[PDB]
């Protein structure tokens, strides 16, 4: 299928490390599985993939929200 | 490049979702999270749709064979624009850009 956002890139199954920023902090979310647009940065994910992504996102936000500001 | 009728019958949309035959874009997932909705949350919104929530179906020059059905349900969390495409018996859900 073609990407639902850019409408050009074919979507290809794969793994990527995805940068993520939250409240002035950042991480790279490792080994995110999905269908990745070859043209833009969009991806498509099923339930399992979505839940695992959001768990890493939510783990990182938990870490940042507890972090001391000096 | 727009129609006033949905490309996929809403009964078929719900059948796919009720069979777990659903995927979402990463942007839609993060967007839904801001509204307090997880993946299952998005599925519940889709199964709560009526025909009256339908806005329009649209295609593009880049992908002229593919249609996206746009719905705008009013939720406790606010009014949300969902875009749905059915590709080989899998529902693909995104949010208006
Ligand atoms: Zn794309």
Numbering used by the authors:
A (entry chain A): 1 to 70
B (entry chain B): 1 to 97
Direct quotes from the study:
Our biochemical and structural analysis of the E. coli MqsA antitoxin and the MqsR:MqsA-N complex provide a detailed 3-dimensional structural view of the free antitoxin and the TA complex. These structures combined with our biochemical data unequivocally demonstrate that MqsR, a protein previously shown to be critical for biofilm formation and the most highly upregulated gene in persister cells in E. coli, and MqsA form a novel bacterial TA system. Our data show that, as expected for a TA system, the expression of the MqsR toxin leads to growth arrest, while co-expression with its antitoxin, MqsA, rescues the growth arrest phenotype. In addition, MqsR associates with MqsA to form a tight, non-toxic complex and both MqsA alone and the MqsR:MqsA2:MqsR complex bind and regulate the mqsR promoter. MqsA itself is a two-domain protein with a novel fold that, unlike every other antitoxin, is well-ordered throughout its entire sequence and whose structure does not change upon toxin binding.
The structure of the MqsR:MqsA-N complex was solved to a resolution of 2.0 Å using the multiple wavelength anomalous dispersion method. The space group of the crystal is P41212, with two crystallographically independent complexes in the asymmetric unit. Moreover, following co-expression, the MqsR:MqsA-N complex is readily purified and forms a heterodimer (one copy of MqsR and one copy of MqsA-N), as determined using size exclusion chromatography, and confirmed using dynamic light scattering. MqsR is a small, globular protein, consisting of a central six-stranded β-sheet (β1-β3-β4-β5-β6-β2) and three α-helices, with α-helix 2 adjacent to and α-helices 1 and 3 abutting the backside of the β-sheet (magenta). The structure of MqsR reveals that it is a member of the RelE/YoeB family of bacterial RNase toxins. MqsA recognition of MqsR occurs at two distinct interfaces. The primary interface is centered on MqsA β-strand 3 (Ser43-Met45), which interacts with MqsR β-strand 2 (Val22-Thr25) to form a single continuous β-sheet (β1R-β3R-β4R-β5R-β6R-β2R-β3A-β2A-β1A) throughout the complex. Finally, MqsA-N does not block the MqsR active site. Instead, nearly all of the residues predicted to be important for MqsR activity are accessible in the MqsR:MqsA-N complex. The only exception is Gln68, which is part of the secondary interface. This suggests neutralization is achieved either through cellular localization (i.e., towards DNA via MqsA-C) or through steric occlusion by blocking the interaction of MqsR with other biomolecules, such as the ribosome.
